[PDB]
Amino acid sequence: QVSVQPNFQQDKFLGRWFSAGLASNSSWLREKKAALSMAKSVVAPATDGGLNLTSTFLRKNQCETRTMLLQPAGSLGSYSYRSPHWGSTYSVSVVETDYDQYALLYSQGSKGPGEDFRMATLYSRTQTPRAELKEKFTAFCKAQGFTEDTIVFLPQTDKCMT
Numbered sequence: 001q002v003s004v005q006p007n008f009q010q011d012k013f014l015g016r017w018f019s020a021g022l023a024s025n026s027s028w029l030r031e032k033k034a035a036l037s038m039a040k041s042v043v044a045p046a047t048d049g050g051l052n053l054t055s056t057f058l059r060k061n062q063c064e065t066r067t068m069l070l071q072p073a074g075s076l077g078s079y080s081y082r083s084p085h086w087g088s089t090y091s092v093s094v095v096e097t098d099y100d101q102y103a104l105l106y107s108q109g110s111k112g113p114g115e116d117f118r119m120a121t122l123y124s125r126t127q128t129p130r131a132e133l134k135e136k137f138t139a140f141c142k143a144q145g146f147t148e149d150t151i152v153f154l155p156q157t158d159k160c161m162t
Contacts, residue, residue: 002093002106008077010051012099017041018161019055020129021122021137021153023146028117038154040161041123046071050079056160063160080110088112095140101125102133104140120144127156 019039039057046052050071057064070079070092077094089110097103102124109117122129122137134153141151 002078002091002108003095004075004077005094005097008094008097009099010045010076013051013094013097013103014043014045017043017103017123017125018127019057019121019154020124020127021134021151022119023141023151024119025117026150029150029152033152036152036154037159038127038157038161058157058160081107083112083114086113088114090114090117096136102129102136104137106140106144118144120146122153127161 017040019041022036037058039055041053041055044052044054046069048069048071050069053068053070055066055068068081070081072078073080073091079092079094081090081092082088083090089112091108091110093106095104095106102122105121105123107117107119107121109115120137120141122134124133138151142148
């Protein structure tokens with residue numbers, strides 16, 4: 001169902017990214033806003049196989065850091081994530097990227113109570129992606145069935161980014 005970036009090259013996907021947009025279900029957004037803020041996300045190879053995604057961001061008056069392990073799931077650019085909290089698994093795909101400016105990711109619940117969860121994410125090498133990039137994101141989000149009220153862009157911030 002979900003496309004992956006053709007000939008995905010993980011060697012070129014590493015290092016610092018910023019979360020610049022998201023889209024998800026109505027309910028999740030109902031009490032997870034206010035207020036979502038921009039995250040700094042660092043991508044590095046995992047010795048257990050796959051990639052570690054380490055995110056830092058402002059939440060409840062403090063900078064918080066979290067690490068997500070993404071393991072290969074069958075095709076280059078297609079990964080799986082197991083939540084350590086209650087154990088749900090999620091498909092996480094790098095749908096489209098140019099490596100040096102943007103990446104569009106798509107996450108879907110696979111098994112567990114998180115099964116029906118669907119979320120798209122815009123990652124950007126800069127904190128302020130061009131209008132054209134924000135349009136690639138809106139386009140993918142709408143094509144996947146997200147309504148405009150569920151598509152949220154996250155503004156530039158300095159807090160927790162250093």
